[model samples]
Target: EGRAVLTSKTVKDFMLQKLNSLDIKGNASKDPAYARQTCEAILSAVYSNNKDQCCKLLISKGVSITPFLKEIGEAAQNAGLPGEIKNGVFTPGGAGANPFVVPLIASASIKYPHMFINHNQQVSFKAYAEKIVMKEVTPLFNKGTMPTPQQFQLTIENIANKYLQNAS
Candidate 1:
């Protein structure tokens, strides 16, 4: 089956709803830390399957992404995310932007760098070495094109399948 597609408008609306549900303060430019925190909370919620809890946490502390990531890392660890994933959360982003979900991809890369490269050959081993930084950590446009959790999971499955197909 083909990958499920989502409209940009729908994705935008979903992200807007998620952001608005939180009690965010300060302009994004004036207080990027808060912006970062909000983003981190969103990622945390996705990982925990506790969107409401993430919203509550964001409203409780209008902080920066760094701390929010720290909390998310703790939560993921508690949830049984492997150590490699936690380390992925620490990679620096391209053009100096903080990654949103680096840990997830980083963990994947650490566990299966060969698979990632084979799936997307245009990407270098070094780049694959830091796939988490590429996929999750980098700031996404959020043009309303987010893949649903099932779709995301399928994408991973596809990548895994590709790995299996190429295995020698």
Candidate 2:
């Protein structure tokens, strides 16, 4: 007959691995309020070509771009990247790796507020742009099939250009 399998459960079971064995050092390398990681997480999804995650990240939570803008400015300053858009390239410490965050904040600053924040909102224009950038542009950039900063503005414009017509 089949017997009870609670033998291990009843007894102390630490024969092989230690309780701390499962512990990971984690990505606790530290930054200003997880500033860099936040940027990395949101952008990496797109950089690695995952559009859906980008959309989800954009819409899943309310994140103010102001903090990111503040952090980015600091990071850029620390890295000696000029706080200017030159020839379509906004330098966040060169390499043209990240140039969109501040611009999005510009959109936020220009518009009202709610108006501002991304995520945790319906019809969030920034959310819309995040999704579109990931879906339409992230891949192109990854594939090296993309545009310059000047050229890229069109992509942003394209996302901003149009939307739903549904009333039902």
Candidate 3:
């Protein structure tokens, strides 16, 4: 053979494997862009201490919650998006004082302003989207734990007019 050998499952398998690991589903299955998007949302979620709404939102789009099981505190640190998790290894007692090599979940929660919400019920989405913990999507979470895509969608639809309730 004049050329090197290669199978049909080279990079494709890696993407599929990642999607399976992340638990993404449906037509978007193994979709590179889809996987990346979900991973970004996941990273965003992992970034925040109490940030889960964004993660849930991404799940509603077909992402799964299985990966989030270990996505808290120091364990939340990771690279890549959606199902393309490049590094997820952990060392014994690696999160201790000066143990070094730590990571997030450091953005979502810090972005939201829980206390501010308490003081001011309605704030700009910009002020609250990444400014509050997970309260912005509390209404959706209030419905139930791990809301389905439809449930998540329906809730967001309701919110579309919630603060915008200029009804007569």
The model with the greatest lDDT is 1
Better of 1 and 2 by TM-score: 2
Q: What is the TM-score of candidate 1?
A: 0.22
Residue-level error in angstroms, candidate 1, position 13 = 15
The local distance difference test score of model 3 is 0.29
Better-scoring candidate (TM-score), 1 or 3: 1
Q: Alpha-carbon error at 59 in model 2, in Å?
A: 16
Worst 10 residues of 3 by lDDT: 97-106
- The best-first sequence of candidates by TM-score reads 2, 1, 3
TM-score of 2: 0.23
Over 1-168, each residue of candidate 2 has an lDDT whose tens digit, in order, gives: 123542431111110111112111111123332333323322432221122222234334543333333333333333333344443333232323222333443434454354345443322333344443333233333322333222333332322221111121
Model 2 poorest 10 in a row by lDDT: 10-19
The per-candidate count of clashes, in order, stands at 5, 1, 15
Which ranges in model 1 have alpha carbons more than 4 Å from their true place? 1-26, 50-168
lDDT of 3 by residue, 1-168 (tens): 112432453222232233233243231245654333332332233233122343435444554333333343223333222232424622212122110001111121232344224433212222222222222222222322333223332343333223223231
- Backbone clash pairs for candidate 2 read 113-116
Each candidate: RMSD:
18.3, 19.4, 19.3
